[PDB]
Design a protein around this ligand. Structure first.
Ligand SMILES: CC(C)=CCC/C(C)=C/CC/C(C)=C/COP(=O)(O)OP(=O)(O)O
Ligand SMILES: [Zn+2]
Lengths: 315, 401
């Protein structure tokens, strides 16, 4: 109704409909600390929310009062809770409220409180129909919005809407193959559908990831995904991989590439491979090439690795 | 010279493989801007330039601790958080807390303690693990009997119980949701006040472990992209519950190291995401923990003087790119300053400044010797002497039942 910026906005202390209620001022003690010098409007609204909350007043007026309160500080979880308490108590039109939250989220796409409320409204309605589309719009604003990603996942699990997300992941990856949030989504879908143990699935992915690395040789996301989907499986178990990786070495190297080989060699040593010394040296070599040259930032890391390979594969 | 200034450092710049994407673009931008900052110190120096503006910082904190402007209205429900951020910030700056503010802090938090246990974003607000973690943490920094006695232990345990879930998780507040951070809040609080019962953390470790993702990091809820914040909360939580082994520590370590920006020298919170001063703690805070863990598992290949990250490189970014002239610290160059970041960047620097494992101690202080901050506990992110002081005090008392 009356926006907090309206030229004609009126204080709750001067609203007749609220006359009967004695606002409750917040108490911070005799000598406040970390005390905010609230604006007059802010203090006013909250002086009345405190009064509404105190007597647990389940009225329509209070429901509307929460709107302003939220505008004034959408982070107020307490306000967010009581509003829902009211929506229930006043049998509120949930779709109307859905329209409310839609508008609000687009406004503060980074607020946790806002998405939580959407979530509740969604399980209440048991209707996820608007979700995927809406999240897609928010993700157009910020394709890495953690909150927007968590919600999509919940929606997809709760409502088992796995059918077209993998295509969505492809869409988003073409838009930005460096979007880690999307690579995670890809893993999420697959581990939640075919599973990665389906060898036909593991092959399609490893191949996909390899083409991706080929295009953007320095994109860490791709590399991380590859390592992820094969690490527990034992990198050294895939001889063809090692051969294709070494093939990138010329026109497609990077510290990630070298890093991956290190792991491969590391796995070989664990698996008690042949030419133990030859490999150990191939590994220690790279560790130093990284430590001192290609990945100096992680020099501390690389020295420990090398130190480890030695500690259990020498003499 | 300085890592960020050496000739070869121009090589650590982003190679977008000629394939521009929203990611490569924004990253390059920050790089160019930081490079600008870098050039400034390479260019001029005749007296030491890497200096922590303690003076300015102390004013910012000393003021905030008392009053805030309405810009802070957005945090009206995060007031205990401000007591913490500030008090921790001063502590690291080795600034002592005057007995009066100490008592006033106590009294404000008292007013923020729900009758039903825990603490809310302010007086008369529903309790929430977050401000709760905060308030407790802040009370222990004051470290007084007065401070400790504010916490109604009996109620604190019941509250923890109300948020406790079957699968091992905890709600952030009643009617809220869960994520790793809440688990961390509980773990933290309970251990310090000594209120851990045989079943309070039943299944919690497994839950948290289920959050560690393919990348080796930890998201908030299982499936989610791995992220510094949650990752820290996760492992620390585990460290408290003595369950770190539940996680694939190998993948976690490799991941963390991979969060430090080669060029910038600081830490990102997610892969392919920008650098941020706060992660200086979040991300770099992991290393001392993983070290503890691996060390406990007799890992022989561990360093006896350094954390597994470019300590030198982080301090430089902090000092060179995260200090505000008016006081306080921040995100990255083009951002506004705030107590939040002021707490974390400092925490992060102290982390990178002090190493300790067994009897081995070895500092690394970039810039003037005076830049040494008070060390911080990698778990609670408060003074180690403070932790020791509090647990000792609460272990005098029996766990509620
Ligand atoms: C103890 C505790 C509560 C820890 C949590 C730490 C923390 C600040 C976590 C979440 C970060 C987040 C979702 C930031 C919003 O910016 P963004 O998501 O766009 O970008 P960013 O992930 O790089 O910050
Ligand atoms: Zn930040």
């Amino acid at each position: 109704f009356l926006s907090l910026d309206s030229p004609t906005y009126v204080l709750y202390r001067d609203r007749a409909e609220w006359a009967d209620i004695d606002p409750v001022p917040q108490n911070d003690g005799p000598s406040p600390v970390v005390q905010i010098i609230y604006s007059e409007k802010f203090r006013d609204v909250y002086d009345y929310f405190r009064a509404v909350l105190q007597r647990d007043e389940r009225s329509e007026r209070a429901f509307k009062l929460t709107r302003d309160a939220i505008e004034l500080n959408a982070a107020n979880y307490t306000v967010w809770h009581f509003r829902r308490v009211l929506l229930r108590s006043l049998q509120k039109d949930l779709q109307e409220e859905m329209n409310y939250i839609i508008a609000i989220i687009e406004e503060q796409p980074k607020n946790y409180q806002v998405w939580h409320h959407r979530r509740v409204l969604v399980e209440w309605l048991k209707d996820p129909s608007q979700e995927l589309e809406f999240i897609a719009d928010i993700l157009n604003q910020d394709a890495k919005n953690y909150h927007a990603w968590q919600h999509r996942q919940w929606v997809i699990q709760e409502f088992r809407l796995w059918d077209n997300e993998l295509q969505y992941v492809d869409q988003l990856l073409k838009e930005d193959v460096r979007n880690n949030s999307v690579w995670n989504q890809r893993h999420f879908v697959i581990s939640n559908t075919t599973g990665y143990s389906d060898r036909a699935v593991l092959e399609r992915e490893v191949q996909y990831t390899l083409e991706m690395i080929k295009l953007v040789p320095h994109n860490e996301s791709a590399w991380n995904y590859l390592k992820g989907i094969l690490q527990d499986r034992g990198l050294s178990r895939y001889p063809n991989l090692l051969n294709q990786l070494l093939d990138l070495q010329p026109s497609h190297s990077s510290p990630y590439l070298i890093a991956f080989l290190v792991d491969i060699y590391e796995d070989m040593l664990e698996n008690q491979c042949d030419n133990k010394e030859d490999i150990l040296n191939k590994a220690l070599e790279l560790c130093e090439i990284l430590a001192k040259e290609k990945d100096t930032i992680r020099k501390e890391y690389w020295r420990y690795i090398g130190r480890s390979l030695q500690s259990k594969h020498s003499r | 010279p300085l890592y960020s200034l050496r000739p070869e450092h121009a090589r650590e710049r982003l190679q977008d493989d000629s394939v521009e994407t929203v990611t490569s673009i924004e990253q390059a931008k920050v790089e160019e801007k930081i490079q600008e900052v870098f050039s400034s110190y390479k260019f001029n120096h005749l007296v030491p330039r890497l200096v922590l503006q303690r003076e300015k910082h102390f004013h910012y904190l000393k003021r905030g601790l008392r009053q805030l402007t309405d810009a802070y209205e957005c945090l009206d429900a995060s007031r205990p958080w401000l007591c913490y951020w500030i008090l921790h910030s001063l502590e690291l700056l080795d600034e002592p807390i005057p007995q009066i503010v100490a008592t006033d802090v106590c009294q404000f938090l008292e007013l923020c303690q729900s009758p039903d246990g825990g603490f809310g974003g302010g007086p008369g607000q529903y309790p929430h693990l977050a401000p709760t973690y905060a308030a407790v943490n802040a009370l222990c920094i004051i470290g007084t009997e007065e401070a400790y006695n504010v916490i109604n232990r009996e109620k604190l345990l019941q509250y923890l119980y109300s948020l406790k879930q079957p699968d091992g998780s905890f709600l952030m507040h009643v009617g809220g949701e869960v994520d790793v951070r809440s688990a961390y809040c509980a773990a933290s609080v309970a251990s310090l006040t000594n209120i851990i019962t045989p079943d309070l953390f039943e299944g919690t470790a497994e839950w948290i472990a289920r959050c560690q993702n393919w990348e080796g990091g930890i998201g908030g809820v299982p499936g989610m992209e791995a992220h510094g914040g949650y990752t820290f909360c996760g492992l620390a939580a585990l460290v408290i519950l003595k369950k770190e082994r539940s996680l694939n520590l190998k993948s976690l370590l490799q991941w963390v190291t991979s969060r430090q920006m080669r060029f910038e020298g600081g830490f990102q919170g997610r892969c392919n995401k920008l650098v941020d001063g706060c992660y200086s703690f979040w991300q770099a805070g992991l290393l001392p923990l993983l070290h503890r863990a691996l060390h406990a598992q007799g890992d022989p290949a561990l360093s006896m003087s350094h954390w597994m990250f470019h300590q030198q490189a982080l301090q430089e970014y902090i000092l060179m790119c995260c200090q505000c002239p008016a006081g306080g610290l921040l995100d990255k160059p083009g951002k506004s300053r705030d107590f939040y970041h002021t707490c974390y960047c400092l925490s992060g620097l102290s982390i990178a400044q002090h190493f300790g494992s067994g009897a081995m101690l070895h500092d690394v202080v970039m810039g003037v010797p005076e830049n040494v901050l008070q060390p911080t506990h990698p778990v609670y992110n408060i003074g180690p002497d403070k932790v020791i002081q509090a647990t000792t005090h609460f272990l005098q008392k029996p766990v509620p039942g």
